[PDB]
Design a protein around this ligand. Structure first.
Ligand SMILES: Nc1ncnc2c1ncn2[C@@H]1O[C@H](COP(=O)(O)OP(=O)(O)OP(=O)(O)O)[C@@H](O)[C@H]1O
Ligand SMILES: [Cl-]
Length: 201
């Protein structure tokens, strides 16, 4: 299936832009979303986590207490392997199920480390969601409750803005009015529909 890889730095709005494509009927694959769904309330994986590490891993609303699980892995690095063994097969299975169930003309794959892990060859097209550096920092501080200095450290551990733009086939700036960003998505959607038809012929 024709595949567009969406990437961008922390705070740029990968998920925000992907949602607009989803609204146009595009199947969006995002490993972070899938990882959250495999540990949703009532899931067997969440039960396994609670039975190993304790009922305090479950909040009163039935969801995973993510901070308590991060604390457990921080104190016991060996439990990272256990968590990976539990969750990776479920994430792989659900990724494949979603691919198979899709009936849209193309797939949008959210790939946060596309450039860093050198995956710029798997997708038919690369879309970069871009914002100024200061915008990344401001949106990350707000969402994640980190210091500006912490946000800067994350940026330094990710691909540079220039590297991401160099790899992009198309760039969407997640700035200005939300309506215009959505119109930009609609224009790219038509481009991708036509490229998918061209590939199919
Ligand atoms: N146009 C915008 N103006 C202001 N804030 C925005 C805008 N678009 C998204 N945001 C906010 O910016 C933050 C980052 O957005 P989002 O979660 O889509 O980022 P991401 O690139 O998918 O994720 P990550 O930073 O984890 O890599 C969120 O709090 C989102 O609400
Ligand atoms: Cl977390």
């Amino acid at each position: 299936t024709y595949t567009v890889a969406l990437t961008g730095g922390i705070g740029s709005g990968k998920s925000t832009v992907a949602d607009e494509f989803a609204h146009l009927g595009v199947t969006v694959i995002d490993a972070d979303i899938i990882a959250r769904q495999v540990v949703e309330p009532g899931t067997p994986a969440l039960l396994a986590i609670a039975e190993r590490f304790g009922p305090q891993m479950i909040n009163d609303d039935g969801s995973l207490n993510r901070r308590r699980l991060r604390e457990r892995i921080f104190a016991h690095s060996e439990d990272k392997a256990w968590l990976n063994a539990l969750l990776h097969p479920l994430i792989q299975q659900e990724t494949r199920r979603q691919m198979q169930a899709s009936t849209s003309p193309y797939l949008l794959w959210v790939v946060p480390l596309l450039v860093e892990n050198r995956l710029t060859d798997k997708a038919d097209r690369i879309l970069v969601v871009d914002v100024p550096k200061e915008t990344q920092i401001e949106r990350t501080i707000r969402r994640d409750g980190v210091s500006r200095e912490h946000a800067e450290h994350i940026l330094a551990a990710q691909a540079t803005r220039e590297q991401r733009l160099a790899a992009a086939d198309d760039v969407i700036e997640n700035m200005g009015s939300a309506d215009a960003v959505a119109s930009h998505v609609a224009r790219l959607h038509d481009k991708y529909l036509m490229l998918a038809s061209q590939a199919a012929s």
